[PDB]
From TrEMBL:
FAD binds at residues 231, 244-248, 285-292, 348, 351, 354, 383-385, 389, 392. This is Uncharacterized protein. GO terms for biological process: circadian regulation of gene expression; entrainment of circadian clock by photoperiod. Keywords: FAD, Flavoprotein, Nucleotide-binding. The chain holds residues 4 to 492 of 595 of the full protein. Residues 159-182 are annotated as: Disordered. The record marks 316, 370, 393 as: Electron transfer via tryptophanyl radical. It comes from Chlamydomonas reinhardtii. Binds 1 FAD per subunit.
Length: 486
């Protein structure tokens, strides 16, 4: 008979899952498996992103239980667990969503050689991305595009991406009964305390497909806001209602399908003729995700500077003091320190908010390597995507794609043009709650009498600015011009 396995790595969803529909077709027993390493903390990861994964895993378990099935969370490594369950469950087909990451290509190639020895058919459909990224490189001549202007004109030449896959049946083939490896006491979704964490998460974004589909409809409640979306015109100092969709964590883990997001955008665009065009449009932002995935998958060492052909070699300085003050939110600038606080509390910031802290650390003030800043974002960001985190940090550090190093974000004026009262700063930095708005961006300029009255003395309660921007920026700007001369 047909007994299949639907492997969950990304694509933690039931909607638009071509790998799940194949594993349920003509099947007698389907096995939904998520391979979890219980020693992942003995090898860098925050409790916000990992608990976001667990909350997303409980969404699958509730969806499988409501359809007569059950999610299996197997412990160990995939190279050591799958050969055991291939013979124990009598598997003839293995389906999992395709992945284009470096570790995934080596991991999957190991699983492919194991299923061949066992006689298991491997089906790997694409659904994490809009298009087949390898197809885009072939149509473009064998090389991937390096500019958004050339990439946007390539996806328009191919046309619309494949429509989202249909929903799975309301009743799925359950796993076989009385299986030792499918025992609930060893295949249950663990909590954040049981995986080896001590402090609870503080984020306000709950993971899961049900939460992803709810935030999608909320974003589409106002179709005029969707059609007239322009990314550079959004408010980075908005936290009560974030001025963007905040769908990056659900798209990263796979709780939300990009194909369904793109299909919902065209329904609004077809009825709104004057809708925004890429790259500033909402569809353009998805094309940014497609563009970086196409370039990074074909470029070696895309997450590094050495051995990376698309990244310019820059003599980044080794300054642990500036790196520690930046990652611990004690640089003296309330606009920068509040964003880093929002990073360790929520795990998500506005794109322009990430622009200020990335510019301040790299080509702007501290001249610290973008890799050291990417590793800090890799820990706390609940939307940690290998290819976006890299191409965007190379963007803000003038290492790739971007080449206008004279544009330096002022860590004082940028936040003040959106929020002069400093509501964003008073929320994440409560030590400056009573500071007047006149000095809330430059607390060192406030008189001592104002510092005493507001309850925040610069040097005792809030640290002094580590650098003078006018002195640090001109130094970094001149060094970038000397680098580009090479
Ligand atoms: C230094 C730096 C690091 C970043 N690291 C990440 C990361 O690890 N993961 C991540 O998802 N994005 C990353 N980004 C991109 C961007 O900041 C986020 O995608 C955005 O803030 C998420 O908000 P949203 O979901 O409301 O986006 P929206 O504006 O609503 O866009 C919708 C979707 O489009 C995609 N998208 C939007 N902006 C970009 C972009 N600039 N590049 C690629 N795809 C984009 C995302 O999938 C996003 O969910 C980074 C940007 C910078 C400057
Ligand atoms: Cl500015």
């Amino acid at each position: 008979v047909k007994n299949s396995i639907i492997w969950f790595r990304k694509g933690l969803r039931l909607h638009d899952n071509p790998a799940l529909l194949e594993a349920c077709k003509d099947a007698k027993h389907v096995y939904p498996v998520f391979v979890l390493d219980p020693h992942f903390l003995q090898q860098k990861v925050s409790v916000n992103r990992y608990n976001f994964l667990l909350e997303s895993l409980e969404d699958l378990q509730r969806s499988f239980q409501a359809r007569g099935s059950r999610l299996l969370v197997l412990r160990g490594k995939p190279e050591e667990v799958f050969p055991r369950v291939f013979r124990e469950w009598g598997v003839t087909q293995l389906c999992f969503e395709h992945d284009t990451e470096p570790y995934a290509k080596v991991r999957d190639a190991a699983v492919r050689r194991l299923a061949a020895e066992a006689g298991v058919e491997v089906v790997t459909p694409i659904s994490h991305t809009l298009y087949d990224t390898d197809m885009l490189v072939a149509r473009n001549g064998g090389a991937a595009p390096l500019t958004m202007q050339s990439f946007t004109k390539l996806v328009d030449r191919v046309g619309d991406p494949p429509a989202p896959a249909p929903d799975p049946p309301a009743a799925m083939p359950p796993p076989a009964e009385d299986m030792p490896s499918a025992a609930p006491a060893a295949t249950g979704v663990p909590t954040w305390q049981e995986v080896g964490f001590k402090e609870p998460p503080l984020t306000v974004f709950k993971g899961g497909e049900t939460e992803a589909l709810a935030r999608l409809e909320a974003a589409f409640q106002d179709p005029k806001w969707v059609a007239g979306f322009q990314k550079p015109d959004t408010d980075p100092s908005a936290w009560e209602k974030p001025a963007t969709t905040v769908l990056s964590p659900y798209l990263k883990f796979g709780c939300l399908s990009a194909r369904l997001f793109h299909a919902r955008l065209l329904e609004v665009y077809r009825r709104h003729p004057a809708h925004s065009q890429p790259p500033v449009s909402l569809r353009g932002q998805l094309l940014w995700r497609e563009f970086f995935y196409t370039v990074g998958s074909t470029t070696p060492n895309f997450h590094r500077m050495a051995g990376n052909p698309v990244c310019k070699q820059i003599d980044w300085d080794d300054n642990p003091e500036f790196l520690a003050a930046w990652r611990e939110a004690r640089t003296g600038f309330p606009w920068i320190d509040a964003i880093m606080t929002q990073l360790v509390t929520w795990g998500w910031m506005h794109h322009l908010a990430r622009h200020s802290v990335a510019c301040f650390l790299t080509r702007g003030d501290l001249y610290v390597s973008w890799e050291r800043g990417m590793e800090v974002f890799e820990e706390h960001l609940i939307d940690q995507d290998h290819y976006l985190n890299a191409a965007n940090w190379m963007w803000l550090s003038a290492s790739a794609f971007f080449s206008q190093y004279f544009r330096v974000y002022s860590p004082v004026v940028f936040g003040k043009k959106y929020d002069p009262e400093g509501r964003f700063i008073r929320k994440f930095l409560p030590v400056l709650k009573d500071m007047p708005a006149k000095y809330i961006y430059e607390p060192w300029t406030a008189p001592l009498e104002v510092q005493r009255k507001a309850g925040c003395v610069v040097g005792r309660d809030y640290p002094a600015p580590i650098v003078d921007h006018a002195v640090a920026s001109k130094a970094c700007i001149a060094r970038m011009a000397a680098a580009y001369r090479r």
